[PDB]
Amino acid sequence: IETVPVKLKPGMDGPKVKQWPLTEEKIKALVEICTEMEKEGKISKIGPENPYNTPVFAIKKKDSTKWRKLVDFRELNKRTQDFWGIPHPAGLKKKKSVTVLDVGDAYFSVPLDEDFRKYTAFTIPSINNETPGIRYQYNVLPQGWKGSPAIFQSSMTKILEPFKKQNPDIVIYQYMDDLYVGSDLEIGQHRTKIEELRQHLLRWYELHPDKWTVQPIVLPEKDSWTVNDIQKLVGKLNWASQIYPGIKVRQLSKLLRGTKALTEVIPLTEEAELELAENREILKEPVHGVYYDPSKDLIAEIQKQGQGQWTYQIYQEPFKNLKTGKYARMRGAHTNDVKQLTEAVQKITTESIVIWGKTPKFKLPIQKETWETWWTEYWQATWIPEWEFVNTPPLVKLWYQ
Amino acid sequence: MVPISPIETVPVKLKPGMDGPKVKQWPLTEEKIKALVEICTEMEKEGKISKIGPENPYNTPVFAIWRKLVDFRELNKRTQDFWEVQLGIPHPAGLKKKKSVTVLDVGDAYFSVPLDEDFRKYTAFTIPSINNETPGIRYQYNVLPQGWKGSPAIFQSSMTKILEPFAAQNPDIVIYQYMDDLYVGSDLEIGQHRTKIEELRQHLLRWGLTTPDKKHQKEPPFLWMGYELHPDKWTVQPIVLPEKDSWTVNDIQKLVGKLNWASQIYPGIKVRQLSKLLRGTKALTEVIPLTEEAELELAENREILKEPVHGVYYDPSKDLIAEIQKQGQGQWTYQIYQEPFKNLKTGKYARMRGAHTNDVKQLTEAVQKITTESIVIWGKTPKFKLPIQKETWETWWTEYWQATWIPEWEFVNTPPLVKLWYQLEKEPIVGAETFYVDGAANRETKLGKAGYVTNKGRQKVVPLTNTTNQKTELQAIYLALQDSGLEVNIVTDSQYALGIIQAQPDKSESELVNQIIEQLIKKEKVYLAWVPAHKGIGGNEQVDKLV
Ligand SMILES: Cc1c(Oc2ccccc2OCCn2ccc(=O)[nH]c2=O)cc(Cl)c2ccc(C#N)cc12
Numbered sequence: 001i002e003t004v005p006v007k008l009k010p011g012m013d014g015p016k017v018k019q020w021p022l023t024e025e026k027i028k029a030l031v032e033i034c035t036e037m038e039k040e041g042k043i044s045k046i047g048p049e050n051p052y053n054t055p056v057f058a059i060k061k062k063d064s065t066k067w068r069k070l071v072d073f074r075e076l077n078k079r080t081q082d083f084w085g086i087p088h089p090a091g092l093k094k095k096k097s098v099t100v101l102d103v104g105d106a107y108f109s110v111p112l113d114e115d116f117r118k119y120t121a122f123t124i125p126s127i128n129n130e131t132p133g134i135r136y137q138y139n140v141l142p143q144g145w146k147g148s149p150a151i152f153q154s155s156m157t158k159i160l161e162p163f164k165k166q167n168p169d170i171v172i173y174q175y176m177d178d179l180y181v182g183s184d185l186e187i188g189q190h191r192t193k194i195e196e197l198r199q200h201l202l203r204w205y206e207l208h209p210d211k212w213t214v215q216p217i218v219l220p221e222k223d224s225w226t227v228n229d230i231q232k233l234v235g236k237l238n239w240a241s242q243i244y245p246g247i248k249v250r251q252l253s254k255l256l257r258g259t260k261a262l263t264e265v266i267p268l269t270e271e272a273e274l275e276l277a278e279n280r281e282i283l284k285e286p287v288h289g290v291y292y293d294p295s296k297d298l299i300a301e302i303q304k305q306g307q308g309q310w311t312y313q314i315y316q317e318p319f320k321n322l323k324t325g326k327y328a329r330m331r332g333a334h335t336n337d338v339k340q341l342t343e344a345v346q347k348i349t350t351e352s353i354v355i356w357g358k359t360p361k362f363k364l365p366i367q368k369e370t371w372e373t374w375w376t377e378y379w380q381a382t383w384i385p386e387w388e389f390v391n392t393p394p395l396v397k398l399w400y401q
Numbered sequence: 402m403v404p405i406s407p408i409e410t411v412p413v414k415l416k417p418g419m420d421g422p423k424v425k426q427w428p429l430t431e432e433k434i435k436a437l438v439e440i441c442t443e444m445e446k447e448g449k450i451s452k453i454g455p456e457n458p459y460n461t462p463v464f465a466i467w468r469k470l471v472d473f474r475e476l477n478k479r480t481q482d483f484w485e486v487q488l489g490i491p492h493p494a495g496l497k498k499k500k501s502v503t504v505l506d507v508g509d510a511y512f513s514v515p516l517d518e519d520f521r522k523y524t525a526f527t528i529p530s531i532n533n534e535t536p537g538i539r540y541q542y543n544v545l546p547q548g549w550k551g552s553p554a555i556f557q558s559s560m561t562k563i564l565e566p567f568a569a570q571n572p573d574i575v576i577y578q579y580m581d582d583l584y585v586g587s588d589l590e591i592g593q594h595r596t597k598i599e600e601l602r603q604h605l606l607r608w609g610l611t612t613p614d615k616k617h618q619k620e621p622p623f624l625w626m627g628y629e630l631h632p633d634k635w636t637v638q639p640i641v642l643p644e645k646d647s648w649t650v651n652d653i654q655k656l657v658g659k660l661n662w663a664s665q666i667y668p669g670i671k672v673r674q675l676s677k678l679l680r681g682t683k684a685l686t687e688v689i690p691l692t693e694e695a696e697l698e699l700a701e702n703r704e705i706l707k708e709p710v711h712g713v714y715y716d717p718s719k720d721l722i723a724e725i726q727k728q729g730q731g732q733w734t735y736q737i738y739q740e741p742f743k744n745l746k747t748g749k750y751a752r753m754r755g756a757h758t759n760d761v762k763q764l765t766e767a768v769q770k771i772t773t774e775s776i777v778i779w780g781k782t783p784k785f786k787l788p789i790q791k792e793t794w795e796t797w798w799t800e801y802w803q804a805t806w807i808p809e810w811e812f813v814n815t816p817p818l819v820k821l822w823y824q825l826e827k828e829p830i831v832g833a834e835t836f837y838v839d840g841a842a843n844r845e846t847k848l849g850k851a852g853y854v855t856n857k858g859r860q861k862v863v864p865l866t867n868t869t870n871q872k873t874e875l876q877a878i879y880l881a882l883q884d885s886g887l888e889v890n891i892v893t894d895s896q897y898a899l900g901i902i903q904a905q906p907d908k909s910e911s912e913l914v915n916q917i918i919e920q921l922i923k924k925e926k927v928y929l930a931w932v933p934a935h936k937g938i939g940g941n942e943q944v945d946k947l948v
């Protein structure tokens with residue numbers, strides 16, 4: 001009920017960002033939604049004296065036909081001053097199960113600092129530039145802004161205090177408009193406890209982190225090897241030598257001596273088998289000196305494997321993976337690569353939020369124009385990460401398969 | 402006297418850390434002075450301006466051309482940024498056909514809207530008196546000054562605020578707002594329409610806004626922003642293409658611009674051979690001759706621009722269809738229509754700047770472009786007709802390493818058809834000869850060697866002058882392709898060459914790459930394997946080309 005003063009970073013003017021074109025139904029959805037919000041004092045129309053603009057579009061969350069409004073607050077977030085810090089709950093990723101809740105509606109109660117409102121300006125665009133776009137600015141705390149949860153930290157604490165004092169074994173984390181709840185209960189007991197917590201939040205996405213882990217480098221086990229087999233093996237081991245110190249491939253390379261046919265079977269020598277075994281033993285161990293640096297950006301790389309299979313790696317320094325995984329989940333995406341990539345980026349970002357409490361910068365195996373054209377059509381998340389586009393095919397593809 | 406409704410002013414500030422303009426008034430002739438005195442007298446009588454005391458430090462230069470001209474450039478440099486919604490303009494192909502349409506141009510646009518009082522003191526300017534033997538006459542604005550930075554945005558916002566309730570009360574008519582002009586359209590009867598127009602201009606008159614009293618000064622066809630707007634159709638204003646035996650860079654820029662502008666309704670317009678001459682630009686004076694390709698291109702452009710072509714308006718009840726054709730040399734053309742032979746509009750797409758590429762990628766890009774344009778214009782994505790088989794696209798996106806997508810589309814057979822020219826094997830071929838290839842070059846002498854050894858004993862090493870490592874490594878693969886059967890396995894250690902071939906170009910700027918492609922096309926099965934260099938891998942012979 002009391003507004004806390006909020007400023008920007010020194011030497012930084014408010015965000016001016018081009019609104020991108022929207023389809024007719026999305027525009028109508030936004031018109032209805034923003035009309036309703038205007039009737040509720042959440043937003044207000046503004047004049048031309050406001051130069052600032054932030055992008056906005058429309059989506060549909062999971063199991064809902066209701067159009068939701070999403071604001072791309074990235075530029076404003078990076079231009080908003082740093083808000084100070086609660087140490088990340090490292091026990092959250094160690095819990096058996098974690099449920100994510102949408103506590104966004106709670107932000108619309110708290111008013112926003114009057115002097116800052118001109119920076120949260122957005123525009124519902126028109127088709128064919130026929131009429132000037134409808135301009136709004138936020139009056140209350142906007143969803144998607146990094147300042148909103150930081151301001152609502154005290155309130156949220158006071159609300160979740162009895163539940164925390166009730167179940168100390170339940171880890172509660174907060175990121176943006178989402179509330180992460182980690183526990184070790186049974187799925188039924190889990191869902192009932194979640195109903196309890198949500199009604200506890202009313203009167204005022206099952207995700208199991210244990211089923212996901214890191215992944216090792218495995219080598220084939222064969223009775224008979226071909227020249228091609230051994231060439232691929234030597235390639236993969238040579239690649240892996242950039243990560244593991246003691247990898248050697250000379251005894252295996254010794255087998256390829258001469259010019260043979262790729263399909264010709266080569267019996268392994270005892271030295272070769274020994275070397276391969278030593279390499280296995282080396283690969284079974286974790287990676288030397290791999291640490292997390294909170295001052296460094298997290299980088300995610302994604303490779304398309306085909307048949308709905310995708311691999312990914314989160315790291316900071318090259319060849320120092322903090323996390324690796326393989327998203328192969330198939331829901332309705334069978335005929336669409338971009339949908340798969342979008343859902344994969346979302347899941348990876350979520351995992352990254354649970355583990356480190358911040359989103360990684362992506363390197364997408366897609367052309368900029370394609371992605372830019374289609375990614376909003378499949379995006380159900382409240383936050384948005386940063387990304388870039390790799391135009392050169394990586395050789396390491398089948399080395400992560 | 403019936404009171405005109407009050408128009409609330411927009412608060413305006415100067416850029417932070419800046420103060421209002423102080424600029425020395427230019428010396429004027431006595432004639433100019435008299436003229437400006439008369440003009441500013443009638444303006445003061447009209448309430449547009451007001452005399453101010455000596456207190457005001459700020460000043461703006463005024464000129465006479467009689468018509469006055471206040472040069473607000475400095476104030477514009479010192480005035481705050483505003484929200485300009487004028488980015489983009491309505492495209493005629495996006496309009497929905499209406500039985501009755503009216504154009505209203507408001508007279509005294511900026512002079513009808515009041516200015517924020519607290520800012521008026523910054524719009525101060527002085528008229529030099531005769532012989533400068535009396536203090537110059539001081540004035541400040543009370544309304545939006547012509548030439549000011551903030552006038553259009555404020556005027557437009559005011560206009561919208563005024564127009565909103567009438568539009569809310571009249572859903573059966575549609576109003577488009579553009580600068581100093583309003584465009585009203587309806588499917589009502591002509592009498593009812595004229596009536597509602599009278600109602601509208603009355604409603605505007607309530608706030609003190611004047612529209613043409615006579616039969617509205619503009620009747621169809623409407624000439625607007627290079628467009629010709631007719632009742633049942635739209636087109637562009639007639640083309641003017643200069644013909645001179647000596648061409649300059651600027652002339653090429655103008656020509657390209659006009660051709661591009663013409664290409665939105667005239668199908669088949671090409672601008673590559675004329676855009677290639679715009680390399681090494683920024684010199685506006687020059688003489689650039691044209692190739693036979695360019696001359697024939699411009700002649701074909703004169704051939705298409707020979708007879709007029711009309712686009713139609715948009716009907717929401719009918720599907721939106723875009724059809725694409727390949728023109729060659731990275732050029733693509735497309736037509737957007739609903740009824741056959743009746744295009745809503747047309748357009749073209751040119752491939753980006755790259756060393757390698759294939760047809761399918763370019764097609765994808767074209768689809769993306771058309772899609773964005775269509776969302777801008779009609780607020781929806783059209784269905785596509787593409788010169789590519791379903792099977793081809795299937796194979797492509799299933800085997801492509803990048804993620805890729807096209808919206809709803811169907812195969813139209815209108816050659817040239819986009820196809821995949823070659824496909825590499827996923828596994829080694831049984832019974833096929835195995836060519837281990839390698840190439841290396843001396844960094845200093847630019848001398849190198851490229852060649853192969855095979856499992857059957859076939860060998861070759863070729864010496865090369867003026868070459869690099871990458872060139873020799875490509876050359877080796879090329880040699881392997883040349884001297885091998887319809888099915889071949891190829892082993893290389895070059896991540897470069899493998900990278901190039903895995904990108905699957907059907908065309909390249911490097912002749913060697915193109916010849917490799919031409920070799921691949923003739924092949925039945927090709928398996929391309931890779932190994933690390935200098936690992937002592939047998940069959941991989943760096944020593945045979947390092948001599
Ligand atoms: C005249 C008119 C418009 O008209 C329309 C205004 C509102 C709604 C729908 C309109 O047009 C639907 C299509 N159409 C068009 C012309 C015609 O004669 N008949 C017709 O059906 C719409 C626009 Cl952008 C115009 C822009 C510039 C000028 C000028 N000068 C006039 C315009």
Ligand SMILES: [Mg+2]
Pocket residue numbers: 839840841874894895934
């Ligand atoms: Mg080599």
